[PDB]
From Swiss-Prot, chain B:
It comes from the Bacteria. FMN binds at S19, V20, S21. Homodimer. Its cofactor is FMN. This is FMN-dependent NADH:quinone oxidoreductase 1. InterPro entries: Flavodoxin_fold (IPR003680), Flavoprotein-like_sf (IPR029039), FMN-dep_NADH:Q_OxRdtase_AzoR1 (IPR050104), NADH:quinone_OxRdtase_FMN_depd (IPR023048).
C-alpha cells in the first residue's frame, strides 16, 4: 500500500453538510490534513454518487466466464473493468476512512456492494485448505465514522445488534486490517445535537493525531 | 382474515435453478403447495427483478417533507408510493420465506434495501421512552433458505461471521416474528452437491409440513 488515504463515503446524501456523520468527517479531514506528511495523498469514493457495481446476473456471468478463460461480452467487460478500478484503488491505500449513517442496524446497501467489489480471491484474500486467509496483512489502518439515532455503548440489545460495526470490524480483520477504530456519533435522537457533535469532534481529532502519528499541543 | 405466505427472493439470478438456494426453495414450494388449505395466498417479490427502492437523496427528502406536512414532488411521490406497496404487502402476510445466497458474510445488498422498506416506525415497529418495540407480535412465521460455500454449524470462525442469519434473526425477532427457522444449504464449496441438495430438501419438506400444519409420514 502507498502513502495514500481512501475515504469511503457511504452516506446517501453524499456531501450535504447537515449530516451528523458528514460534519464529523469534515472535522476529521481538516484535522488530519494538518498533521499528515507531505508524501500522503487522499482519494474519495462516493458510494451513492460514483458507480459501484452491484452483483447481478451480468456480473455473475462475467465472473463465471473469466474463470473459464471465456471471452466476456461488451457489458460484462465494462462492468468488470469498473470493479477492477474500485478494487485496485482499495488495494493502493494503507489508511481507510468509512463514513456512514446507521439505518436499520446494518451497513448501507451500497456499502455491501462496495464490499462485493473489494473482497476478491487472489486479490484481497485467498482460499487455502483449512479455509481462507487475508492478503492485506501489512499494517493498514481503518477508521469508521458512524452517526446513529440510538446509543450502542451500553452493552445491551443495541450493542448486540450493531451489525454495521460487527460486520465491518470482522471483514477488515479477516482481510488483515487489524488496526480498527470506530467513532460513534451516537444518540442523535435522544442527546443534545451540540453534545453529539462536540464529543465526536474530540474523538476524531485524537484519531487524526493517531493516524498521522503526530501529537498537537497548545498552552491555555 | 386472509392467510398469506410471502416469498422474499433475494437471489440475483431470480429463477435460475442452477442456483442451490433457488433449487431448494422450489422444492420447498412444491411440498408446501400440496399441504396448504384454500385459505392461503402465495405471493412473491423478486428483489433483483422487481422495483425495490433503495434509500437515496430523493427518499430522504420525501421522508423529511412527509414529517413536515410539505407537499412531495412527483418523483418523491413515486418512490414513496412504491415503498408503501412493499410495506403493505409485507404487513399483510403471516408466513415469510427469504431465499438468499451468502456472498461475503452478510445479506445481499437488495435485501438490505428491502429491510429499509419494511422497517418503518409506527408501521412495523414504534419508538417508546424506553427504546423500541415491534408491532408485529401476532404469531407470524419466518423461514430462511440460505445457500453458502462454507459450513456454518461447526461453531468456529464461520459461525462467528454469519451476519446474514444473525441480522435476519435479530431483526425479525425485534419486529415480533419469533417463529424463525433457517435451512442452511451449506458447504457447496466442500461437500458432494447431491448430499447438499438432498439434506436441504429433507429440511424444507419438514418445514413445509410444520408451516402448513400437515405432517405426512411414510
Ligand atoms: Cl448522518
Ligand atoms: Cl445459491
Ligand atoms: Cl435459529
Amino acid at each position: 500500500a502507498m502513502n495514500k488515504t481512501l475515504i469511503i463515503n457511504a452516506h446517501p446524501k453524499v456531501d450535504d453538510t447537515s449530516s451528523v456523520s458528514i460534519k464529523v468527517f469534515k472535522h476529521f479531514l481538516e484535522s488530519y490534513k494538518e498533521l499528515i506528511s507531505n508524501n500522503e495523498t487522499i482519494e474519495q469514493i462516493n458510494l451513492y454518487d460514483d458507480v459501484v457495481p452491484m452483483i447481478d446476473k451480468t456480473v455473475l456471468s462475467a465472473w463465471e466466464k473469466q474463470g473459464n478463460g471465456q471471452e466476456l461480452t461488451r457489458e460484462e467487460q465494462k462492468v468488470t473493468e469498473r470493479m477492477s478500478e474500485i478494487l485496485q484503488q482499495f488495494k493502493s491505500a494503507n489508511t481507510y476512512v468509512i463514513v456512514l449513517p446507521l439505518h436499520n442496524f446494518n451497513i448501507p446497501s451500497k456499502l455491501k456492494d462496495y464490499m462485493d467489489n473489494i473482497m476478491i480471491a487472489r486479490e484481497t484474500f485467498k482460499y487455502t485448505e483449512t479455509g481462507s486467509v487475508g492478503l492485506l496483512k501489512d499494517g493498514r489502518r481503518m477508521l469508521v465514522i458512524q452517526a446513529s439515532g440510538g446509543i450502542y455503548t451500553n452493552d445491551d440489545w443495541y450493542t448486540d445488534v450493531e451489525y454495521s460495526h460487527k460486520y465491518l470490524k470482522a471483514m477488515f480483520n479477516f482481510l488483515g486490517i487489524e488496526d480498527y477504530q470506530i467513532v460513534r456519533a451516537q444518540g442523535t435522537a435522544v442527546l443534545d445535537p451540540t453534545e453529539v457533535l462536540q464529543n465526536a469532534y474530540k474523538e476524531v481529532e485524537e484519531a487524526a493525531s493517531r493516524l498521522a502519528n503526530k501529537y498537537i499541543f497548545s498552552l491555555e
